[PDB]
Structures are given as structure tokens and as C-alpha cells.
Amino acid sequence: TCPMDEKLLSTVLTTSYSVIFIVGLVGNIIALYVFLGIHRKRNSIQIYLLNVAIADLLLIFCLPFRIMYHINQNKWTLGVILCKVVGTLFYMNMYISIILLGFISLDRYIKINRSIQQRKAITTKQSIYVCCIVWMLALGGFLTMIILTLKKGGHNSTMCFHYRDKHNAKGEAIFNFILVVMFWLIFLLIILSYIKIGKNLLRISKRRSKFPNSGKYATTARNSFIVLIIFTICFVPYHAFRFIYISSQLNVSSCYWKEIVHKTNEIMLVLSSFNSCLDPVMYFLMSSNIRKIMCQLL
Ligand SMILES: CCCCCCCC/C=C\CCCCCCCC(=O)OC[C@@H](COCC)OP(=O)(O)OC[C@H](N)C(=O)O
Known about the structure:
Its main location: membrane. This protein has eight helices and no strands. By secondary structure, the chain is mainly alpha-helical. The protein binds ligand KW0.
């Protein structure tokens, strides 16, 4: 290996992940309470948000093991089993979050731009179907990768999450390439969905047929682009560098490349978990009723 100094990396990762842990924990607990407590009835969007809250709660649950490993001595005291379990559950949660984000955007685009009257709220059915399908497929992929790693591989060690070349497991390289291309497709769908939502609300505000509360359309138009840009800044960096990460991880290379690649990936993961901790606060603020509840309570 090439052991370059990483005390500053350890400190920044520990503090960032601890802040993300506390913020995402409080955000996701309050979000779960407001999705099961004060929402006796659920809509498709509320179902998808509840599942994003669950996925993110599991990501904040994954965080403390990462902070322990990074702060203790940058050494992994537990077995290779727990290493692979946490390292796989984290990515499982991230890509479940991203798929559910895409699904919310798609339903908002079918609800806002093209819906003329309503849908008679028959949407919770296929909402629960799609959420259960995606969760089961994600459990399938997570267990597949964890069993293909724990037994088929020959390499286990006493340190975790560190940079390891995937020449020992090319299946993981191809799995990550598949995941990156599908994330870019999902983000293309999100960008189409939210751009079209903003444009439709902008034109409707431009006509302004009915004078009363015609400005709420401006607020919603800004909110569409806000959530698109937050998702764009919190995810596109990581998945844009991941192509270079895979390309470097499956060829002969010097170590100096390896330190910069590893530390870039650490910062990008800090960003990704930052999104997973923001999203509940985003739903708290963007909803009129919840924002009024918070403002009158605070
Ligand atoms: C329609 C098909 C969609 C397919 C996915 C279904 C939903 C998603 C379900 C769960 C993802 C499971 C984890 C996948 C891991 C991909 C990323 C990756 O390569 O992580 C590797 C793990 C180690 O895994 C064993 C080889 O990395 P770590 O060692 O935990 O961290 C190393 C490094 N810090 C890094 O993360 O690059």
C-alpha cells in the first residue's frame, strides 16, 4: 500500500459524519413522526417520502461505525463481516434514496404538468407496490454483493472502507458501473421533471387568470428548481468522479493517484450523506402546512 498522511482526512470525516448523524437523526425521526403521526391518510408522494425517510434513517444508523473507524486509529476492530455489512448497507441506502427521489419527481411531473382534474387518489396502491418492489430488489442486490464478497474473495484485513483495487472482484466494478449509469439516468429524469414543473408553473403565473394568491405559483416555481439544484449539487459530484474512480480501480497505476482518489471519494461521500440529512428539513420547509406549524410553534 501507499500510506500517505490522513490525520486531517480522519478529522474532517469524523466531524462531518457526526454532524450529519445528529442532523439526519433528528430530521428523519421528526419526518417519520409527521408521516405516521399527523398524516392519518397517505398519498403516493407521502408514501415515497416515508420510504426516503426510512432509508435515510438507516444511513444515519450506518454513520456511527464509520465515525468510530475514522476517529479511533483509522483501524477496524470488528470482523470483516461487519465491515462488509456496513459498507454495503450504506450504498444500499444511498441508491434506494436516489431511486425514491426519482419516483417522487416523476409523480410530481404527472401530477402537475399533465393532470387536468385529479386521479381520485388511487395512487397509494401502486405507490406501496413500487416501494416494496424497490426495497426487495435492493435487499436482493445487497445480499448478492455481500455473499459474493465475504466468501468468494480471498482478501480480508483489519482496516475497513479503505481503497482496495477491484481486480480481486471485477463483478463489483461492473456492478458500480451499472449503478453509476442508472443514477445518471434517474438524475436526467429528475432534471426533466423539475425543469418542466418550474416552466409550467412559470407560464401559469404569467397568465395569472385569478388575482387572489397568484403569487404562491412563484413560490412553488422557485421550490421546484430549488430541490432540483440541491439534488444536483449533493449527488452529481460523487457520481461524476466515480467513473474515474472505477477506471483507476481496474488498471495498473501509481499510488499518488490512489491517495487523491481515496480522499476525493471521502469528501464526495460526506456530500452524499449531507443530502440524506437535509431532505427531511427540505420537506419540513417546502410544505405550506408544515412550515406554518413550525413557524407558529417556533
Ligand atoms: C435495477 C438494478 C439496481 C441495482 C441496485 C438495487 C438497489 C440498491 C441496493 C443496494 C446497494 C448495495 C451496495 C452496493 C455497493 C456499490 C458501491 C461499492 O462498490 O461499494 C464497495 C464497498 C465494499 O463492498 C465490497 C466489495 O465499499 P467500502 O469498502 O464500504 O468503501 C470503500 C471506499 N471507501 C468506497 O466507498 O469507494
